[PDB]
Amino acid sequence: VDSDEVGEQMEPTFEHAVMEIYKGIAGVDSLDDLTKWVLNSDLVPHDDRLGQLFQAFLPLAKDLLAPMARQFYDNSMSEGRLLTFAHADSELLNANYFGHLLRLKIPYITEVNLMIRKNREGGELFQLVLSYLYKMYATSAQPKWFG
Amino acid sequence: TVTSPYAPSVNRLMPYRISNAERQISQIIRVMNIGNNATVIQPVLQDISVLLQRISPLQIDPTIISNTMSTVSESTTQTLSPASSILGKLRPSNSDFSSFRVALAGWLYNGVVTTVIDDSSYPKDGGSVTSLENLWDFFILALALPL
Amino acid sequence: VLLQRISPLQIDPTIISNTMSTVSELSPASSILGKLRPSNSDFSSFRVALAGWLYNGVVTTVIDDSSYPKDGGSVTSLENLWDFFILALALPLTTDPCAPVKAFMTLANMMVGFETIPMDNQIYTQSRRASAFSTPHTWPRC
Amino acid sequence: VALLSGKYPPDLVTNVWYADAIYPMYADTEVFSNLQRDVITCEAVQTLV
Amino acid sequence: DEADDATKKQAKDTEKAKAQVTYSDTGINNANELSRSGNVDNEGGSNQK
Amino acid sequence: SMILTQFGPFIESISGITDQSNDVFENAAKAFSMFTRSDVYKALDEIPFSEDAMLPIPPTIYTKPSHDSYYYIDALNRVRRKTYQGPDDVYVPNCSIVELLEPHETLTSYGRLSEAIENRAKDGDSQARIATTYGRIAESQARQIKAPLEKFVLALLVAEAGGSLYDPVLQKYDEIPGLSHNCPLWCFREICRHISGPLPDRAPYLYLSAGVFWLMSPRMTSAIPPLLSDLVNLAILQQTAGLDPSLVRLGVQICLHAAASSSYAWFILKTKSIFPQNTLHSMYESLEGGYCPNLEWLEPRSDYKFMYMGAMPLSTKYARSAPSNDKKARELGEKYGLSSVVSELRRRTKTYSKHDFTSVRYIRDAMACTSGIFLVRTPTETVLQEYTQSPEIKVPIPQKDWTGPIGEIRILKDTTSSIARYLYRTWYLAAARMAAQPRTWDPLFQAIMRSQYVTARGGSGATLRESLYAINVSLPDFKGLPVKAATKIFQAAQLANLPFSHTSVAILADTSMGLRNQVQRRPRSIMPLNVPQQQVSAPHTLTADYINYHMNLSTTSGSAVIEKVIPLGVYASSPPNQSINIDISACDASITWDFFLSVIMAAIHEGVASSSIGKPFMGVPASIVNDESVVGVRAARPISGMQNMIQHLSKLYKRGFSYRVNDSFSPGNDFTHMTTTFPSGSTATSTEHTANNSTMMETFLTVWGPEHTDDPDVLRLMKSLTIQRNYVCQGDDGLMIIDGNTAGKVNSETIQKMLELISKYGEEFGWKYDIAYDGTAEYLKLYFIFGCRIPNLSRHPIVGKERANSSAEEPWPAILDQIMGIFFNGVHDGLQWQRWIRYSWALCCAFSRQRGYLQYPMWSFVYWGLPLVKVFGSDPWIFSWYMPTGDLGMYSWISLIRPLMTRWMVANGYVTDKCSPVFGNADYRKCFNELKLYQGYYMAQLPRNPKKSGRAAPREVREQFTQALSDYLMQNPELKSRVLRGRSEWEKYGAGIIHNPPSLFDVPHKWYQGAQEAATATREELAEMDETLMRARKHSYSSFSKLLEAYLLVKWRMCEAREPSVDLRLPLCAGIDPLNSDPFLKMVSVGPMLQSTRKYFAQTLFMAKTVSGLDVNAIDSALLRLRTLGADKKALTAQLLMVGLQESEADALAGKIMLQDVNTVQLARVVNLAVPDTWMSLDFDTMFKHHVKLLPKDGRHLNTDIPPRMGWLRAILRFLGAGMAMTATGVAVDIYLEDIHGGGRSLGQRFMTWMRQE
Amino acid sequence: AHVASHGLHGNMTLTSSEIQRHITEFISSWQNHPIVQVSADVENRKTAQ
Amino acid sequence: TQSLVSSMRGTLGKLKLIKSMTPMYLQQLAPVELAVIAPMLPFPPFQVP
RNA sequence: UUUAAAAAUUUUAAAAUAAUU
RNA sequence: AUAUAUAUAUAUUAAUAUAUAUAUAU
RNA sequence: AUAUAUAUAUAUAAAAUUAUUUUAAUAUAUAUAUAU
């Protein structure tokens, strides 16, 4: 099961739902201005601005993604054993996931792939800020070596 | 410590200063409005009493008297217990310990209020030096009168 | 624990009961052991005090605050007499330098109202705690 | 019984105690308004006379 | 009001719920300070009309 | 007419007219038994109700839709409810019930679920499963009572037939309206009528042991059982509590609106706060006067010592200043159509402007009118609604504030910018100080903590077994044992000879499910953790305990509630002071790994490291693990046993828990569910919750408050508060006292702003504080306003009894305990004393006979505590309920009547030529046998539970079981060496003085029995109890107990009324006012409880701690038998060794035993005289000390003299004085010793022979 | 007390008469207490002034 | 009382001559054990006079 | 010369009733 | 005739669900 | 592949605080006294 499947099956999909998050900020007026207000002229965004953004990103993840996943993973469990991926253990914990929960990790710098790959929804900067938000929604625990 | 500003003012108008005659006259009037009643002056003493209790760092507990008395040795085969008699007659009736603060607040008013000790506190129609429970009454009155 | 596997001594508080159980008769024969005892502290504190002798440069064993007569002795009492006796026996085995002045001021506190002595100021009056002392600057001139 | 049994808290520092026990009663200003009443009382008495 | 607004803007600029460098409610007594409002004109009279 | 013609003598007897007697009692009980439900509803038909009880009933209550549209089926084959409004509508709906029933064979108008539907559902059909789930759940909702409602209604008619009563104190008949103004009875009768219709059978369903049979009528629904239970409760409360009939109407209206809605329990759950929100939380917007208590809290606040200092008058400045409760209350009232009721309450409340008895009675009446039903729903709905909640963590700990891993744990960097650092510091210091204590390193403490959780209650041993099976490890089964199967004793016996690395795989095993309903709250949930999971969670609970008891020290756990917790509310609600009520909503679901458990585990893993460097904890090895906390270094570092356990516990907490749900109400639901909610069955639960509560509040006030608020007022308010002087918490709930300064009550806007700061503080790390600031106290379900406790009568439903399963109830005589409990619950709530006593008389007959019959004489009920009325030709209503229960109570009520008691005997025949010292010449020995006094007095003392006999298991397997259990208990060589040395020393010295000296080898022989009696009783034991009761009834008795005989030699003298101990104008408990004469006089002349006087001779020789398997009785008797005979001290030391103590510790205990001469333990063991339950609220300590005088009134007598070496006798004398004084109605009086027949020395010798014979 | 001392103290039993006796004895003390004598809850015009 | 005074004096007199071996232990065997344990020890002694 | 203070310990392990988290 | 206590003696150990096998019918 | 009757076995429901009540023969026999 792809990692994006549980978020793609929504009328406004999840990433589209979070792209409209710049309205809650005090003033941004556009997604590019959001990516500029968050991290400065490299990655490692401003922690305070990232926190102000996370306080808005969180209710989208607790009230929409968790209820949708709680049904999607049940429907998937009904039709056989499947190997499912996710972006954070909190996704599989809040949505009450059954099975073995294996955290994992890769020996590379994953943040650079978010600039290498091109044809993704929203700018590459938005994909990267989204990855930061998932990493901030992560409930620190040992990822333990994908191999 | 209160603070006042130090700079060119704006010419306030705070009319709060009056002579001594204008104050003694009102004192005479409000003392004339209080003579002989005793239901007009009791609540003032009660209010000052509760204020004294709230401002004072003093506590009251009869456990001090209990522990002090418990160290004297009394015979088990007797008919009179000096330590056990004062402990009995040293518990106030209707369990009110207010009379202390009320007497302490009556010091501010001896021209219109005279705090006397109640007739019930005396030895009930003549004492007798041959009576232990009746000798503790003299002890209590002697300690309590000077206040 | 090393002193445990080594030492031949072994404590027997029944000696106290044997000695006290031959008095005919507030009862002095029922104060130290049967009453005034922590009930959970066995005698590891003893050999911890013994092991503290080797390390008076970094560690300074002192008598706990909770083993004093609780704000005044009042020698008229009996439990406080026993408390004084036990503190006076236990103090010499510690390693802090102010054990003697604490042993003196325990009785000085207990005998307030009966006997008086001149102190150094009005902060460390005779009615202080014996444990509030323990700096060499706080030993009374008297 | 009040005279015989008294006690202070073990952490009593007098200045620190009174510094915040006495503060809340000097933050209200009813005492200053109790003077204009006396002004008007004296004015009324003199006007009647 | 302007001191309060400056404190709030400072809190927003430093991205905190409460600004650390505050311009209002300092320890100083500044009850005589003024500013320029639209209440008074150039003659010194009020600006009701 | 009918009830009168049946039992006029009984009406006369219990109504204080005719002297009571056993014959009228048993005849009335006959009338109760031989009596039918049609007779009940006909008797209800005889009542000519007035217009006052009239009321418009909604007709929609009867025509209801079908159940099919309310349910559906999940993608996981789970039948679950379809919510129509909100995610709360998952309770039983209101639907028809007739189309699913098949006619019962005997009673052709009643029936249960058709077997066709059940079988078709068992085959696997959709509609059949849905219908059977609906039927079973409706039955379970209708089974939540303790007996058939018609029996309670009959008892009510019995009691009320007598009419009004005469007050011996107020000298007048009380004005309580008769049954013709009781609109609950009217609604009950009208609903039963309109449902029955033309059918002859009148009961709409008959409650039975197995299940309920529904009356087959088209006008039937599933809401009727709870509605009828509500109406019965309201009727009984109005008749025995004097509720005014103007608020019972509103209660009945709300119950009707509930029964007319979609679902009943859901409406009652959404509408549970209309009476409190409009009466208690809105009182006194305008004060004019009244008195409130003046308590003063003593200085070392942490110990909870108080002192009452009189009543201070109230004034206008103390009026209510909390924020208004108007807009929200009217919004709630409008959303559900209850706007007229809300407006009526909001109007009637604004007319009380004086803190008075009448206003507190108003609040009590307004709050007794809320329904007291046990809410019920399917288990698969509880598990799917509660366990899906997850924390809402708005400011998580940054990922760059965790070091590398050390096994399963990461450490907080010391330079963290978060707020979790204070949590980490608190738990770290607590763990270090806990582990530093040398007590936690002996085998005895290890063994005590091991045996703490080995109980006879389930622990889901199955999944443990089948998880150990998955790694090819065997386990004994012990085939043929009469012991229960699902018990932690069974698990422990299995897991004796197993290394930790084998059983450690069973730490990740799942847990079974438990359920339990409540009043006005969703059905509880439970999870029992197995033995390994309870073992590995030892450091967590130990550190939580150390925090609760030494470091933070702001809690009421471990303290007596009625001596320390009641006057806390009395102090925190008095007017100058104020109270804020803080609660954490969903506390279990808010404690997870991402904020709390990770920090706590790192803290407990680091703090223990210093003083446990290589040692094993409770049977856990000293494992190793590599760490990466330091950058650039990666080295394997040894750890301890207490750290190995934290490793395993962390790898359990990280994944969450998996619950195996299998409900017996829906066929086809046995799924498994996985949550992150913290369990509610762990040993460490209730302590860590309160530790976290206190820690977060203190870090609040010390750090987070001053760094986010700017106004000087809130800063000065948060700086003057500390958790140890202004905060009290226990588990979830909490309380924050705010003292009043000299200017009066603290300002309201500042307190509000602090409250919203607390609300913002909770959201950063998950918690959701439910804060309530409105001028009333709240703690552990105790309400207070202006220092007046207000009992919540809706929380104690008279008829309600809870049954979270489908198992049948315990057979009679098991219900008499519940009836006595009903009486006592009525006692503690201050009901009208005459009315409540009479109703309890009428109710203790209906539950007295049942099938070759066996009947209780009334004397048994008088022995259990129920106070008499008119026995022996005395005055009506002389005895109060404060008379204790048992021998003391019997002596108390006898000695007050003894002269008349004997002259009546002599006046009807009973005469003999034997001058008894007690009763003179009358022959009590014949009459009391005739009057059935001895019979009841000795039948009451017989147990009413089937004593589970051993079923004679095989010798081989039983020996193996007990041996493996003992091996589990004494696991390390040190305990075994201690006990073996003790046995050797005993056989050297103590051989002969005792034959079976107790040791740590008899613990398994008690665990084995405790596993036995957890099973079900057998018909043999039931018949045995029945025959034993019949035998004990059919003897001929010659005297009371020896203790009561010795008691009856002492006489007393009622001299003077003691001075008042509280003002007669100060309300201290709502409902206890001059209208309630006897409780008022007792309270005002004795005074409330504010002291600590526990343990009136609970002395014993064994002052140490051992395993929970052992008993204090055996060791105490052994030490007493070894100290009275005067053996060598080596015998005492050998006993204390083989009871599992260290050498030095055992010898210190021997010295203890040698001190404290044994004349006191012997009496304490021979006599059983304790303070009864009802005296807990009064000040009995000063009554013992000062107001029961052993020197009689006119001096010495030569009879009351007591020898110098018999001091224990003064104790029993003070007993008898206090009991005889408290039994009589009116005010408590000074009682003086009068005369002891025989003499002081003779009575002392009588007690001394008994003390010696041990 | 007259009628009670009439009645042969050894042969006393409970009675409404005894209840009334104790109640009157009890309420005399509360009536004669001085704070109870001089006290009130509601303010008068003069005290409010 | 004189009885209590005599009992206290007798208790002191007997406690003065209690038969304990801890003092002779401390002076004869304890220092030998400390000296025997001192060399074989992870953290050597650190003393001031 | 006779009398007398006597110990206020615990956290008491399990089974039933009631209150609560 | 019964019961209580005294000394001794003796024996003595204390509801829903599922699985398996038998039988009868299809 | 199934249905019914029978027999056997198995699984399931917790922790804590508070207060009250109960937990040294199992039985018989001889000699002693007493009560009914």
Ligand SMILES: O=c1ccn([C@@H]2O[C@H](COP(=O)(O)OP(=O)(O)OP(=O)(O)O)[C@@H](O)[C@H]2O)c(=O)[nH]1
């Ligand atoms: O059925 C449970 C009820 C609670 N208690 C224990 O009390 C603690 C808290 O109990 P709860 O977590 O159930 O209270 P709550 O959140 O439902 O409060 P509200 O939202 O209704 O306001 C838990 O730790 C649990 O162990 C259990 O012993 N029994």
Ligand SMILES: [Mg+2]
């Ligand atoms: Mg709740």
Ligand SMILES: [Mg+2]
């Ligand atoms: Mg709760």
